[PDB]
């Protein structure tokens, strides 16, 4: 991986050689799939619950005697047969979360980054510097870089100017090197990084 470099202007300069262990590796799509489902699930909230025949109000008395009537045996007006009724099993609050092993998850993120550098939806850009915190400047930068779609932006230490900007844009997200996901990477179609953040991710990986 010897990918080009760009400035905040959008002008090319000398290229950059990357850690082949992190970027120059063949991906594992089964792994990526698993990680995606894990995260996609972990984001759930589990606020689904219904009223059992015990939890529902009333019931209690045998509404009519077991025998003598032509009617059917019934124990309560809240059993599931009934209009009001208590639900049989239904949902109930829980957590869909699970955790994978560390080797697997880091392989996953390595794989997807390798895929990004393969299909060349990756951009290195040293020295993001904004005199302001505005969005016009950011959008102009992205225009100069020919970024017409979703996008992810990476720093090392949370440029608050860059975060205040770039959020009002719908398809754009910002994060530090420590906060990288696989899901954001996959979803945002294109990746912008500072070489500082590159050294960080590749030294922790």
């Amino acid at each position: 991986p010897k990918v080009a470099l760009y400035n905040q202007n959008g002008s090319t300069a000398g290229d950059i050689e990357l850690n082949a262990s992190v970027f120059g590796i063949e991906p594992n799509e089964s792994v990526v799939f698993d990680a995606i489902l894990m995260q996609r699930a972990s984001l759930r909230q589990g606020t689904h619950k219904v009223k059992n025949r015990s939890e529902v109000r009333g019931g209690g008395r045998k509404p009519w005697r077991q025998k003598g009537t032509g009617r059917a045996r019934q124990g309560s007006i809240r059993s599931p047969q009934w209009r009001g009724g208590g639900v049989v099993f239904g949902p109930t609050p829980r957590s869909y979360s699970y955790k994978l092993p560390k080797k697997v998850r880091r392989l996953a993120i390595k794989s997807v980054l390798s895929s990004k550098v393969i299909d060349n939806n990756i951009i290195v850009l040293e020295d993001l510097t904004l005199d302001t915190a505005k969005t016009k400047e950011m959008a102009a930068i992205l225009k100069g870089l020919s970024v017409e779609k979703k996008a992810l932006i990476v720093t090392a230490d949370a440029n608050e100017a860059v975060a205040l900007s770039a959020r009002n844009i719908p398809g754009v997200t910002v994060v530090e090197a420590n906060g990288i996901n696989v899901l954001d990477v996959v979803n945002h179609e294109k990746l912008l990084i500072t070489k500082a953040a590159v050294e960080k991710v590749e030294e922790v990986l």
Binding site: E29, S30, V32, F33, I36, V112, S115, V186
Partner: protein
């Protein structure tokens, strides 16, 4: 990958078997519980070792022995795992825990001769076996004890 071309690894995923959802499934009207009986009911069954009033196996069999309070389950090394170390280097349970050879020290360490050596080492442990220490000094090592 891409979210709109996802697919799993084959064999990783399967569809669950629903029942009471028709006869074309082959699990309709009984869910594979067959016809009437104690096993076909809701909460229906018996405790696992039950045999229908026959005196079950464990009761017809006797108890045996006891447990010691002062038992020692030494952590075992089998003398081939030592070949991973450098020549002439000392050895300790601390060192083994560091290397990850031992995931758990349980009252001490014992070494055993399910292997061989090509190295002399200044080994020290809690306890040895006869074959093990002989193999050690034969390779030229030593047999210190903690």
């Amino acid at each position: 990958m891409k979210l709109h071309e996802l697919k799993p690894s084959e064999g990783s995923r399967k569809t669950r078997n629903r029942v009471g959802r028709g006869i074309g499934s082959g699990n309709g009207k009984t869910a594979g519980k067959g016809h009437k009986g104690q096993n076909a009911r809701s909460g229906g069954g018996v405790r696992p070792g039950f045999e229908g009033g026959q005196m079950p196996l464990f009761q017809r069999l006797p108890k045996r022995g006891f447990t010691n309070i002062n038992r020692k389950e030494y952590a075992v090394v089998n003398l081939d795992k030592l070949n991973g170390f450098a020549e002439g280097t000392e050895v300790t349970p601390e060192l083994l825990l560091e290397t990850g050879v031992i995931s758990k020290l349980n009252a001490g360490v014992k070494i055993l001769g399910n292997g061989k050596l090509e190295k002399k080492l200044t080994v020290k442990a809690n306890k040895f076996s006869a074959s093990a220490k002989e193999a050690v000094e034969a390779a030229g090592g030593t047999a210190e004890v903690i």
